Amino acid sequence: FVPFEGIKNDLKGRLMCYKQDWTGGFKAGFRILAPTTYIFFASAIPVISFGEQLERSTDGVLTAVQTLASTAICGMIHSIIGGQPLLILGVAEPTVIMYTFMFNFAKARPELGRDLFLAWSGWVCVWTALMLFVLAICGACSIINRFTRVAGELFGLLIAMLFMQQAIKGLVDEFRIPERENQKLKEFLPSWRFANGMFALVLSFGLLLTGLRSRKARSWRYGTGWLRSLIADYGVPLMVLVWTGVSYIPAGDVPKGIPRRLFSPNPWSPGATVVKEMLDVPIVYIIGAFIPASMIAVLYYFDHSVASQLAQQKEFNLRKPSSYHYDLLLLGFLTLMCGLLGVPPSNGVIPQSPMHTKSLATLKYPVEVKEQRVSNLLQSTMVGGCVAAMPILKMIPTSVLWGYFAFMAIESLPGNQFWERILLLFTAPSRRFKVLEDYHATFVETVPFKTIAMFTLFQTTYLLICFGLTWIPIAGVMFPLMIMFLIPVRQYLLPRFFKGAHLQDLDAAEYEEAPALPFNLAAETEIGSTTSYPGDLEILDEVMTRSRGEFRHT
Amino acid sequence: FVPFEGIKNDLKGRLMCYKQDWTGGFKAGFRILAPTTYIFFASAIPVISFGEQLERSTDGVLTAVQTLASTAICGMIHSIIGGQPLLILGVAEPTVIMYTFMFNFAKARPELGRDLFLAWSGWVCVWTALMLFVLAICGACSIINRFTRVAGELFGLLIAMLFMQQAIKGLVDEFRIPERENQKLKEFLPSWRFANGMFALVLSFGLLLTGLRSRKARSWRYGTGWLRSLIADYGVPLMVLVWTGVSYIPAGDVPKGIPRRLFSPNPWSPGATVVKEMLDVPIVYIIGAFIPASMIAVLYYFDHSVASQLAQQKEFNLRKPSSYHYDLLLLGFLTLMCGLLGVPPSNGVIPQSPMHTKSLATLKYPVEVKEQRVSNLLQSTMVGGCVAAMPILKMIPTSVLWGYFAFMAIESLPGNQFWERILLLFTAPSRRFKVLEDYHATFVETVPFKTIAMFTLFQTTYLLICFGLTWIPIAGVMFPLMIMFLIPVRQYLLPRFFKGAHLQDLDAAEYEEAPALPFNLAAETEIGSTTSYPGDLEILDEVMTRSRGEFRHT
């Protein structure tokens, strides 16, 4: 933990591959645009959704303009002078939640109010930048190996819960009058409001289901290869466009605001740095900003490092070194800059970074990744240009964004072992052989079900407590402390209750899977030792057709 | 083809097992109620949907009351004095289409009009009864072995197309003012109409998707066995109830008719035999009724026999004989009775009859079927009692019935080989190995793809021509003739163009399936000889998690 050692080593390592980092990007030619566009679409849409969320949560102080600007500027700076260009930066949901807490605190205090919210947030960002500088200089990133699966998966499920909560919140508001809108408009009559709510339900569920189906296009037996890849890569934006077009079908027979569209304003309209108002904040609140700043620094020190680790998985066979410490230092500087500019800070986001690395990967029949600084710079510049295209983006209905929130919530589940363990916990004892008939984790076979159940119950209790804490008006801004407390807990307390190899299998740093087992081998196991025979109607359901009741012959 | 031989033989066979047919039903005790209730729900809901369809198509002359009454009375008579009690009778979609054609013909002719439509239909039913008597006496049912798969599957797909068309028709009308309603009501304002249409979309799609998911409950690893069986058996009625309840959520904040509910009237209200008006029909039209009567007799002679055959599949190991000829004779008598009473005739329906037989089946570890006349009688009496419960049924929204129409359309597909062949025809040449990696028909391996393609193209052209003919105002009532022409076509013309075993495999009376093949064996085949290797992103999609981009280790 020698000060400045990690930063110096990272800088020495990354300074030998800068010119190559650029030339290899230019040598790829126009073929570098496909990963660029893919990651640009993967980054922009969630950022716009978070911007709308903030617009609703901050009474219009922060909108999609600010989130897009922060994402673009931070991404460009990271691409040019950052250590690991594979890392993708952007505004994330936890930052939105923290800023919502801060806004709610400031609004109820006359000394700050809505007019000094951004100044107080700038002071918070100054504190966060200092904390991140200290963490990077002291080499705190040398212990990121202790950021085990138990904390990451719990945080992911918490963020998925919050995504779904936001989706439900928005869909319920689609039936209500907005707070800052003229209540006398025809679009806000009870009939038109009910119609708008129903149309929002239709559009949101359509987007969600169609995108979820599109995600598995490359496995279809239909169409061309390029068409299947196009669907699998750009389904989300394609479905957003399709459902916007659908929303425009009744445009001629309904009022202007049916369905409701994005509330974020257009920056080009004449109606439209916070350092000047920063001096006006009372000293007591300048000092008190230390409190949320510590939580934000915790969140960033976790998320940045985890995203970089995921983007630098050893299976990619990357040949260039890592820059964790210098990356955290630059993140502190970027947070200071964003606080001074009046925009929310950005940080490493998941799964955008590993998806970018994958988009830059090819197999030599064996993974080889094309690492360079051009794709990140171009995608960040496109995210920035999206600000100028705000008139076009304002045509998107809000229900589509709520559907996208639900989409992210559901997409956080697939590879999450905590979710699989919850499903197993709620599974019937006589139907676990079914669990054993498909791809499954190894701890299902190597760990007794009682220990899995106890571990999952502890994890679920922790998750529910954190979710409930998020609902407390003021104390809810402490949930990153609860997230970090899982490190010492896993390191010290769990070994007392759990026995070694069981913990290692249940909290493995590597995703270990197992292939499907034959039915005969799925019963000799302890977990599948309570196999019950199928019923008569269960058997007949499979040997007779549903269309005409015809017996199938095999 | 000796006259009265088949009827006499069937009567002699079925007269030796009547008392046992009843006693075995009474000996089953209260356990006979589960199949009874299952088949009652399987029969009632489509009949109510057809009743609403007729109400919209006949300007209120025929409604769900008449369809329910016909189904109940015919089922009871068949249960008591019928030959094969496993056969389930009811009003079917083709009868609805024929009656719609007849109503449209009568309305445009001042000599008949809406006031003599039922009388003309009674004369049509008299002609149909005479035709069926002739067919049964002459032993025309001795050649039902020529009702091959090519005709049955084409007819099924045509009826599925018509189901989906009715669903779309109803959902579009949910946005419009009904023809015979007061246009000044608040519920028919543009805003409330748009809201009603959107709510109808929501409810219909919810019903459809939830029912389709419920159909596969017995294969779940969750819940109890009895709960899974309950879901798999009663999902459709359960989801109808659930979505009706959902429809009642905004009842306090919306006008009376939001959402629209069943239009069929309640027979108990004071506002509410056609032999008297039958004498008033002109002689020319009495004679002309011969034309639609022949088509209806074709439809019934096909459907009754096919449904009985499906209910009497040899795999059920039934120990009692068949009564095809006497069943057709009784169907003629029932059609005469229904025409005299002013209700549409009923006939054998699919897949209700084989599903009833399956519900009466148990495996002795080997199928053993409990054949008796109690379940059919009880379910028919319950269908009849549903008439008295019309006030409760009128609470169902029409959008739920349109969703059920779409549900039947989609449920007609699974075991249909014509649909599978269409999908194969539109499949990519390089992705047929995927077809070979799952359960598939044998002709995929035993027949070249060119012959399958030609056969499927001919069948699809025939189907589309029949569907288009259904759209012609008057000539569309001839489509049963097109259906029957497939018998001589298959028997005489196809062998000229197709070569023996290929036709036998493509038009086998038995549903022949084949198990999944290994990838190595799926390429040596001629059809799977154009296997293309997966792409880099296709490979990476499977080895990395979608939630966090984590490499999977196997």
Residue numbers in the entry:
A (entry chain A), B (entry chain B): 5 to 276, 281 to 373, 457 to 645
The authors write:
Full-length AtBor1 was overexpressed in Saccharomyces cerevisiae, purified in phosphatidylcholine lipid nanodiscs, and the structure determined at 2.3 Å using cryo-EM. Our 2.15 Å structure of the wild-type transporter is solved in the inward-autoinhibited (IAI) conformation and reveals previously unknown detail, including C-terminal (Ct) domain swapping within the AtBor1 dimer. The TM domain of one AtBor1 monomer comprises 14 TM helices that form two distinct subdomains–the Gate and the Core. The gate is formed from TM helices 5–7 and 12–14 and provides the entire dimerization interface. Several patches of non-protein densities are located in the gap between the two monomers. Phospholipid molecules can be fitted in those densities, indicating that protein-lipid and lipid-lipid interactions are also involved in dimerization. The Ct domain interacts with the transmembrane domain through conserved salt bridges and obstructs substrate entry from the cytosolic side, rendering the transporter domains in an autoinhibited state. Importantly, we were able to resolve the Ct domain and construct the model up to residue 645. This revealed that the Ct domain comprises two α helices (H11 and H12) connected by a loop, followed by a rigid hairpin that deeply inserts into the cytosolic cavity of the neighboring protomer in a domain-swapped manner to block the permeation pathway like a “plug”. Our IAI structure illustrates the molecular basis of an autoinhibitory mechanism in clade I BOR transporters.
Boron, essential for plant growth, necessitates precise regulation due to its potential toxicity. This regulation is achieved by borate transporters (BORs), which are homologous to the SLC4 family. The Arabidopsis thaliana Bor1 (AtBor1) transporter from clade I undergoes slow regulation through degradation and translational suppression, but its potential for fast regulation via direct activity modulation was unclear. Our findings show that AtBor1 is regulated by two distinct mechanisms: an autoinhibitory domain at the carboxyl terminus obstructs the substrate pathway via conserved salt bridges, and phosphorylation of Thr410 allows interaction with a positively charged pocket at the cytosolic face, essential for borate transport.
